[PDB]
């Protein structure tokens with residue numbers, strides 16, 4: 001419901017915080033919905049503690065939201081996100097690359113295809129090089145060329161890869177005039193160091209606030225339809241404290257407090273990318289049995305013949321005068337159990 005949105009948001013912020021620990025004072029950029037979607041999809045085929053660990057790690061309490069409701073919730077979410085929207089490109093889909101010799105349950109396959117935007121491909125993982133290339137170029141195509149080389153290394157014993165992809169392209173409700181963009185303006189990257197970036201500039205009415213508790217400025221920039229960007233600008237030295245406070249509760253607070261008024265606004269034009277090896281992180285967060293010799297994916301294949309081995313994510317962002325283009329992909333790799 002809006003219950004799910006609250007849970008998924010808090011998962012995003014907790015995972016975000018894990019990243020600030022693994023790569024401190026560095027660019028962070030990921031798609032929470034992509035990561036959550038891949039794991040939920042994996043959970044559809046899992047049983048018992050293997051299944052429950054995955055959803056609990058995603059933030060859910062199975063007393064509050066039974067397994068079945070979580071499944072239906074995520075199927076509804078991905079359907080809604082993919083629903084045609086004028087002036088907005090947003091697609092999120094998944095692909096299952098199944099080994100030639102695996103015995104996937106027709107139930108699992110029919111379910112993910114009908115209910116979870118899944119394309120299924122029979123894959124010859126005995127040519128591990130060609131398989132890696134096939135999967136990479138499919139993710140590349142589905143992300144409109146924006147996510148290149150998702151998979152760097154694929155284990156020779158790989159017998160299944162689950163991939164989720166997201167592509168987003170939208171125009172600002174109020175685009176910037178490139179004739180007002182300063183070619184070269186300073187951006188502070190640490191206390192004593194600046195980099196030069198093009199700085200877009202406009203004066204318009206925007207929803208905004210100063211959080212008096214957190215000492216950050218929050219700025220909402222709408223896209224032309226069904227979407228928005230939130231920029232959170234901490235006071236000097238206050239990034240750590242703002243990061244600690246990010247939560248669904250904090251977003252709900254801001255939603256009430258944001259007020260539309262005139263702002264003389266300067267936003268950088270830039271592109272960034274980020275990659276994450278997620279195997280160890282997901283284990284630490286509580287996904288354990290999925291990796292073990294006693295992994296229970298009895299809902300996926302006839303012979304419960306696999307276990308999770310690797311996971312990784314790549315995401316890219318561009319912001320310019322016209323709008324924003326962002327893409328991401330998540331993969332989970334399985335080997336014989």
Ligand SMILES: N[C@@H](Cc1cc(I)c(Oc2cc(I)c(O)c(I)c2)c(I)c1)C(=O)O
Nearest residue numbers: 002005006009220228230248251252254255
């Ligand atoms: N106020 C305008 C603009 C706005 C939309 C969203 I989406 C949002 O982000 C969240 C995220 C979660 I999770 C919530 O529970 C809530 I409430 C808002 C915020 I901040 C502001 C609107 O409503 O369209």
